[PDB]
Amino acid sequence: DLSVRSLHDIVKPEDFVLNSEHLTTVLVAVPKSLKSDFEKSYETLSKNVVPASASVIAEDAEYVLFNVHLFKKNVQEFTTAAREKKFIPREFNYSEELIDQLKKEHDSAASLEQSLRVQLVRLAKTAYVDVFINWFHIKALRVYVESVLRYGLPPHFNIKIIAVPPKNLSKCKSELIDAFGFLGGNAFMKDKKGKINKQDTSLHQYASLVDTEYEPFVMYIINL
Amino acid sequence: LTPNQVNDELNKMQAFIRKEAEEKAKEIQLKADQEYEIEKTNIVRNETNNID
Amino acid sequence: SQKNGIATLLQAEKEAHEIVSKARKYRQDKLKQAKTDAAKEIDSYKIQKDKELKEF
């Protein structure tokens, strides 16, 4: 789309002339309707407009992109005259450094996104494992210390990880509560199930830093 | 555009190209006449004052 | 007709630019000329003072 775009990959030595300074090239972004209107008008926009220069070097859906060659002084008259007709000039000259730098910007931008994406996909996967080993280290620690706080002695505990098949968690949690619950409270015990996460209330979050609903024995629920 | 108009613009454009070059070249070599004289009198006047 | 119009004009442009180049050439030589033709008057003026001194 033309509104900021200047071409740099469709250059040619004759559709784009600037080698001294007498001749220059102005590009004109012309709506499709207006394409005939430009082919007719191009010569009249200023005096000293080079003959038959008006050709569509590039074309898109909304716009057709023209080149016209003309004298440098006359470029001011040309541009203003172009805007009355209700075209929009896009200014690009054929200085060597211009052509090269825009081309470079496309390339340098593809190379930055490319390198980065490969390191970034790799970095997350490598990060993922480390934070996994570390998450379980805290839970193991957390559970151990808690057990000491709630049961007291012995410091030697019987500890298991039980794999529950998906959607049997609530039924599993209840059965454990009935059997073992008496140990940590014979009155501090109620039936409960599943794990609900909230910021409505702080109850039901099973934690020792904010007030929660007291579980009858140490049980922590891991959702993956 | 049509072949008669493209030859009409072709004679007009190369008329300007030369004319601009000729005009510029004329200011350039005119100034050269002025600079030769001023600077030539200065170089003389300065050192003839030393000799005196 | 695109590379017909461009061509007539490119030939003109290189001939135009060369005329401009000739004038700058002329202009650089005139500035050298100034110093050369000033240097030639100073050393004639010098022995002229010396001549009227050696008489003195």
UniProtKB/Swiss-Prot annotation, chain A:
Belongs to the V-ATPase C subunit family. V-ATPase is a heteromultimeric enzyme composed of a peripheral catalytic V1 complex (components A to H) attached to an integral membrane V0 proton pore complex (components: a, c, c', c'', d, e, f and VOA1). Interacts directly with VMA4. It is found in: Vacuole membrane. Keywords: Acetylation, ATP-binding, Hydrogen ion transport, Ion transport, Membrane, Nucleotide-binding, Transport, Vacuole. GO terms for molecular function: ATP binding; proton-transporting ATPase activity, rotational mechanism. One of its GO terms (cellular component) is proton-transporting V-type ATPase complex. Subunit of the V1 complex of vacuolar(H+)-ATPase (V-ATPase), a multisubunit enzyme composed of a peripheral complex (V1) that hydrolyzes ATP and a membrane integral complex (V0) that translocates protons. V-ATPase is responsible for acidifying and maintaining the pH of intracellular compartments. Subunit C is necessary for the assembly of the catalytic sector of the enzyme and is likely to have a specific function in its catalytic activity. Reversibly leaves the enzyme after glucose depletion, causing the catalytic subcomplex V1 to detach from the V0 section. This is V-type proton ATPase subunit C. Present with 21114 molecules/cell in log phase SD medium. It comes from the Eukaryota. The chain holds residues 169 to 392 of 392 of the full protein. GO terms for biological process: endosomal lumen acidification; Golgi lumen acidification; proton transmembrane transport; vacuolar acidification. It is a peripheral membrane protein.
From Swiss-Prot, chain B:
Residues 12-31 are annotated as: Interaction with VMA10. It comes from the Eukaryota. It is found in: Vacuole membrane. Residues 1-13 are annotated as: Interaction with VMA5. Residues 8-38 form a coiled coil. Belongs to the V-ATPase E subunit family. Subunit of the V1 complex of vacuolar(H+)-ATPase (V-ATPase), a multisubunit enzyme composed of a peripheral complex (V1) that hydrolyzes ATP and a membrane integral complex (V0) that translocates protons. V-ATPase is responsible for acidifying and maintaining the pH of intracellular compartments. Homodimer. V-ATPase is a heteromultimeric enzyme composed of a peripheral catalytic V1 complex (components A to H) attached to an integral membrane V0 proton pore complex (components: a, c, c', c'', d, e, f and VOA1). Interacts with VMA5; the interaction is direct. Interacts with VMA10; the interaction is direct. Interacts with RAV1 and RAV2 components of the RAVE complex, which are essential for the stability and assembly of V-ATPase. Present with 16134 molecules/cell in log phase SD medium. This is V-type proton ATPase subunit E. It comes from Saccharomyces cerevisiae (strain ATCC 204508 / S288c). The lineage of its organism: Eukaryota, Fungi, Dikarya, Ascomycota, Saccharomycotina. The chain holds residues 8 to 59 of 233 of the full protein.
UniProtKB/Swiss-Prot annotation, chain C:
The modification N-acetylserine is found at residue 1. It comes from the Eukaryota. It is found in: Vacuole membrane. Present with 2280 molecules/cell in log phase SD medium. Subunit of the V1 complex of vacuolar(H+)-ATPase (V-ATPase), a multisubunit enzyme composed of a peripheral complex (V1) that hydrolyzes ATP and a membrane integral complex (V0) that translocates protons. V-ATPase is responsible for acidifying and maintaining the pH of intracellular compartments. Belongs to the V-ATPase G subunit family. V-ATPase is a heteromultimeric enzyme composed of a peripheral catalytic V1 complex (components A to H) attached to an integral membrane V0 proton pore complex (components: a, c, c', c'', d, e, f and VOA1). This is V-type proton ATPase subunit G. It comes from Saccharomyces cerevisiae (strain ATCC 204508 / S288c). The lineage of its organism: Eukaryota, Fungi, Dikarya, Ascomycota, Saccharomycotina. The chain holds residues 2 to 57 of 114 of the full protein.
